Design a binder for this molecule. Structure first.
Ligand SMILES: C=CCn1c(=O)c2cnc(Nc3ccc(N4CCN(C)CC4)c(Cl)c3)nc2n1-c1cccc(C(C)(C)O)n1
Ligand SMILES: [Cl-]
Length: 260
């Protein structure tokens, strides 16, 4: 077994229908990696194309400071294995939950830093003619003095000829629901805005219904933080009903409210 041979398993750090994720030490180099171990999906299935999307996303992307680095992927024992960078801070979702527990919070500055960093990740992905299509707190990872990195590339697809597996409904732009895939990068932008709103301590986002539609009308969820009207206005245009009115990733990262 390659997994057993090359790595020592330390701790399970995730589980779901996707399988399990393990913090592991690679014996050769002594470095820590996050390894996902999944049952190999049925051929030609939803699970397979999603798994495929991730490998071939990696084939294109290479390496960037705001994308979780991919090292290797292989299959054995009717299981799939994906070896990624280990981010010692967990996901943004984990951080948000912990914030709520010990009633801490991300400062307004920290929200802007989060927005800029993931924005840089998106600009790179978009520059490679790809879109993430599943941006949300649980897919943003934290290293350490803090670095935010985009992970979980299972929904990544091409801007040109996309195979769109829709992401979490809570973060999904209406035009994607409407099967309008002519501006998918702006769907990532929509999702990032709501991701920041979650980090800002907004109540849980709706899966559907009235509240759901209200958001897609360009109405921000309620936010207990005292945020500047300017930063607030930036988050609002990011969820504008017209995706062409939303800023591109590159327009986002060179925005005044964010800089520096
Ligand atoms: C390889 C799989 C994707 N993935 C990374 O690339 C990846 C890179 N780094 C981390 N770091 C990290 C994840 C989780 C905690 N904790 C432990 C203690 N608590 C249980 C809270 C969470 C800590 Cl400390 C570090 N995780 C990563 N991944 C990861 C992990 C779990 C679930 C998922 C899913 C649901 C598939 O998205 N992914
Ligand atoms: Cl676009």
């Amino acid at each position: 077994s390659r997994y057993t041979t090359e790595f020592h398993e330390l701790e399970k750090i995730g589980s779901g229908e996707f399988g399990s994720v393990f913090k592991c030490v690679k014996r050769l180099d002594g470095c820590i990696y996050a390894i996902k171990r999944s049952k190999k999906p049925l051929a030609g299935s939803v699970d397979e194309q999603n798994a495929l999307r991730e490998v071939y996303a990696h084939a294109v992307l290479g390496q960037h400071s705001h994308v979780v680095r991919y090292f290797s992927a292989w299959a054995e024992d009717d299981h799939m294995l994906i070896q990624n960078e280990y981010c010692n801070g967990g996901s943004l979702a984990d951080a948000i939950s912990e914030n709520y527990r010990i009633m801490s919070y991300f400062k307004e500055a920290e929200l802007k830093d989060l927005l800029l960093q993931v924005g840089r990740g998106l600009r790179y992905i978009h520059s490679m003619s790809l879109v993430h299509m599943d941006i949300k707190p649980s897919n943003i990872f934290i290293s350490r003095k803090v670095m935010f990195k985009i992970g979980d590339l299972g929904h990544v697809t091409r801007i040109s000829s996309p195979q769109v597996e829709e992401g979490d409904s809570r973060f999904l732009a209406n035009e994607v629901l409407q099967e309008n895939y002519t501006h998918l990068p702006k769907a990532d932008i929509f999702a990032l805005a709501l991701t920041v709103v979650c980090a800002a301590g907004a109540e849980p986002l709706p899966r559907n219904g009235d509240q759901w539609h209200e958001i897609r009308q360009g109405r921000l969820p309620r936010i207990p933080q005292v945020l500047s009207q300017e930063f607030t206005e930036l988050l609002k245009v990011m969820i504008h009903p017209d995706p062409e009115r939303r800023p591109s990733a590159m327009a986002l990262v060179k925005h005044s409210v964010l800089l520096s």
